[PDB]
């Protein structure tokens, strides 16, 4: 993650991220709606950060510092490059929607009026197909990935030292190899929760209330298909 985005999403909520004089110019329902939108983006930023830890710190680190077959590393971090590409492009669209929404003269004051369209494009058509096929694969290879890690940690002494070394920073306390895998699997089930609460405070503009309803149904369709395509593997 980059410092610019880390600061924009450092605050605990949208009401605490904007200036208090900007917040005081808005209706309470607008503040409640913006808070859940800010959380969707804040958690997407964390999700992309989780995927970057898996790719650059764990995956790349093992390739560059360990004598492990790339097939072993493939088993440890399945579909991480594809998941990184899918979510980094989603974070891009969310971050530019926030930037467009900014008040001229400010870098923290914004109100997003349209979100649903972005969620429909993401959770429909080819993008949804690629995401459904990627999450089905990831979740079917998830158990095999946890097992393979445990075997490597309980047999290889240099792999054990690599893990101790890279996970030492405080920033990586909740971001070990196995935490990262579960954090990724649990991500898709967070979207209907976040979208339903956004939809619950977006009954002002009707074309927005309908967009969030189509996106909610589209995410649940995606989840039902990802769930149906799971079939656990073992080595």
């Amino acid at each position: 993650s980059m410092e610019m985005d880390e600061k924009d999403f450092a605050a605990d909520s949208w009401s605490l991220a904007v200036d208090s004089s900007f917040l005081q110019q808005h209706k309470k329902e607008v503040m409640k709606q913006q808070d859940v939108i800010y959380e969707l983006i804040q958690t997407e930023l964390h999700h992309v950060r989780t995927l970057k830890i898996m790719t650059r710190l764990f995956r790349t680190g093992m390739l560059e510092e360990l004598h492990l077959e790339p097939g072993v590393v493939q088993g440890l971090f399945p579909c991480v490059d594809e998941l990184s590409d899918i979510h980094t492009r989603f974070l891009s669209q969310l971050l530019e929607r926030r930037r467009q929404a900014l008040c001229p003269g400010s870098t923290r004051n914004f109100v997003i009026h349209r979100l649903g369209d972005l969620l429909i494009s993401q959770f429909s058509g080819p993008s949804a197909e690629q995401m459904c096929k990627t999450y089905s694969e990831f979740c079917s290879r998830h158990s095999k990935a946890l097992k393979l890690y445990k075997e490597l940690y309980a047999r290889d002494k240099r792999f054990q030292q690599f893990i101790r070394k890279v996970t030492r920073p405080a920033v990586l306390k909740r971001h070990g190899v196995q935490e990262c895998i579960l954090l990724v699997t649990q991500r898709i089930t967070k979207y209907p929760l976040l979208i339903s609460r956004i939809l619950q405070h977006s009954h002002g503009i009707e074309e927005e209330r309908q967009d969030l309803t189509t996106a909610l149904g589209l995410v649940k369709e995606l989840l039902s298909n990802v769930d149906e395509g799971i079939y656990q593997l073992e080595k």
């Binding site: 009401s15 158990s143 946890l146 909740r174 954090l183 649990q186 929760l193 769930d227 149906e228």
Partner: protein
């Protein structure tokens, strides 16, 4: 400091997300309560032992029978959450969550936690429940459930008032340490 894993299971609005957020923040979120919980690694000192308790939630996984069990690998303590203002969420403890938790997590200690105990003295909660020929879960009913499902224990708490929250996670750590 030994690493241990905690998972929380239970129906949709049993308050499991609220409980994890209130514990991981220490207080009730004053300005905004988050919709979701990602994970947390808590440093807990119970009975002279320094433990690293990893906190996980199954919220959002209730309708996905193939996705949900991926939360279970290497669990050391399970919190079987139910809402005290919802006697129906207690009826699903012995036939919905208990068989699943005993199949994927055999021998893992389970603590039956009765959430939202503040609602036992809520006039609006009792009025709505009366129109259903019901009343909030009595302490004896929760203990009778914990005993029936062979739970390690039964505890009550209130994520709103923070009452009982620290004692649940401390007891969970004690239970996870036993082998």
């Amino acid at each position: 400091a030994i690493r241990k894993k905690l998972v929380i299971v239970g129906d949709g609005a049993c308050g499991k997300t609220c409980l994890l957020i209130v514990f991981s923040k220490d207080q009730f979120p004053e300005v905004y309560v988050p919709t979701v919980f990602e994970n947390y690694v808590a440093d807990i000192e119970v009975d002279g032992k320094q433990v690293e308790l990893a906190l996980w939630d199954t919220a959002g996984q209730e309708d996905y029978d193939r996705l949900r069990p991926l939360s279970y690998p290497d669990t050391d303590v399970i919190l079987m959450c139910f809402s005290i203002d919802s006697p129906d969420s207690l009826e699903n403890i012995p036939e919905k969550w208990t068989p699943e938790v005993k199949h994927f997590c055999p021998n893992v200690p389970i603590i039956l936690v009765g959430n939202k105990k503040d609602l036992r003295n809520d006039e609006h909660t009792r009025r709505e429940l009366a129109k259903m020929k019901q009343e909030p879960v009595k302490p004896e009913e929760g203990r009778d459930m914990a005993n029936r499902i062979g739970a390690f224990g039964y505890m009550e708490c209130s994520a709103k008032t923070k009452d009982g929250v620290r004692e649940v996670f401390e007891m969970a750590t004690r239970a996870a340490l036993q082998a």
